């Protein structure tokens, strides 16, 4: 569904246990009500809430898990440009 750009400013704001957003690829996700059900545990998401998790997410998930677990309403929309360096997760 053809959806609106979201700014990095707004994303960075969503970064706590009960208001958690993430940027995978260049897209935005509200992972808040998903938390309790993450087979990878809550912490990993919490620890990285409000960040770009592309480099961690992508090597641990096949491209077809997002649509199995996550309601499309929670696929928030595409990122406007890019997350600031400080808020992009790198491989460990």
């Amino acid at each position: 569904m053809n959806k609106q750009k979201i700014s990095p400013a707004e994303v960075a704001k969503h970064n706590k246990p009960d208001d958690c957003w993430v940027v995978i690829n260049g897209y935005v996700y509200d992972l808040t009500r998903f938390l309790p059900n993450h087979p990878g545990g809550q912490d990993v998401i919490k620890f990285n809430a409000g960040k770009d998790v592309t480099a961690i997410f992508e090597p641990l998930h096949a491209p077809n898990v997002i649509d199995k677990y996550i309601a499309p309403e929670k696929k928030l929309g595409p990122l406007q440009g890019s997350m600031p360096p400080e808020l992009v997760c790198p491989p460990y």
Epitope: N25, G26, A62, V65, D67, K68
Partner: antibody
Framework: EVQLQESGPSLVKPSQTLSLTCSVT????????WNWIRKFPGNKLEYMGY???????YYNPSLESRISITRDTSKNQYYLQLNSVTTEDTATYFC???????????WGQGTTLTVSS | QAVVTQESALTTSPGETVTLTCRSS?????????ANWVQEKPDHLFTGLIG???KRAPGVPARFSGSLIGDKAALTITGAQTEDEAIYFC?????????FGGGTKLTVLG
């Protein structure tokens, strides 16, 4: 340095149930996505499906009714089951791993399977 | 279910740069398709080359690169070698299903 070896029959009559093994030595199958690929006689490759390092499955929507991928971490192997076999299933079967979302690292040698009465 | 289409065959000679491309039937390929490329040499030999559009697999010669050219994924071989003579398969993640095309036969004039 990391080997995938496929096992199974070389021949099976149509109607039967084919059973394939992939033995993995050099790395734990609890790490990447573990998959099945077919190479038909005409050069066409077909992605069969996968099992995760957690046991989660996915199957080609054309094979859901037949295919079944299992795994046993103890022996460090996974499996492919494909019943209601048909002439069309004649091909060479490969297991390969997928650095989830990225590239294929590690393919097996493959085993040829023939379906014939 | 998208159909992934790629060149019948391509001929080239050592040293030259060659590009192989990969089209999905439903629309333009973006990085969300996580384009993937594998090579098949004679004797059932398969090697993973590219993943996530432009990520080189380990052990893969730097002459191999992937990119997004127009509306399709692209495999670039910069300075092709005679041993690069083999069949190249493209794969796209479309509609939560991973789909191979019919592959390209790349001849590298030896």
């Amino acid at each position: 340095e990391v080997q995938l070896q496929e096992s199974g029959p070389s021949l099976v009559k149509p109607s039967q149930t084919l059973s394939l093994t992939c033995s993995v030595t050099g790395d734990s199958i609890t790490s990447g996505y573990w998959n099945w690929i077919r190479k038909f006689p005409g050069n066409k490759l077909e992605y069969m499906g996968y099992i995760s390092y957690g046991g989660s499955t996915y199957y080609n929507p054309s094979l859901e009714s037949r295919i079944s991928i299992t795994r046993d971490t103890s022996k460090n192997q996974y499996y492919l089951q494909l019943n209601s076999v048909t002439t069309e299933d004649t091909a060479t079967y490969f297991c390969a791993r997928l650095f989830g979302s990225y590239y294929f690292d590690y393919w097996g040698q493959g085993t040829t399977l023939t379906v014939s009465s | 279910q998208a159909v992934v289409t790629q060149e019948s065959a391509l001929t080239t000679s050592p040293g030259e740069t060659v590009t192989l491309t990969c089209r999905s039937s439903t629309g333009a390929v973006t990085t969300s398709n996580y384009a993937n490329w594998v090579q098949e040499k004679p004797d059932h030999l398969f090697t993973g080359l590219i993943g996530g559009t432009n990520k080189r697999a380990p052990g893969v010669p730097a002459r191999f690169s992937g990119s997004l050219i127009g509306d399709k994924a692209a495999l670039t071989i910069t300075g092709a070698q005679t041993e690069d003579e083999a069949i190249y398969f493209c794969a796209l993640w479309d509609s939560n299903h991973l789909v191979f095309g019919g592959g390209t036969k790349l001849t590298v004039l030896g």
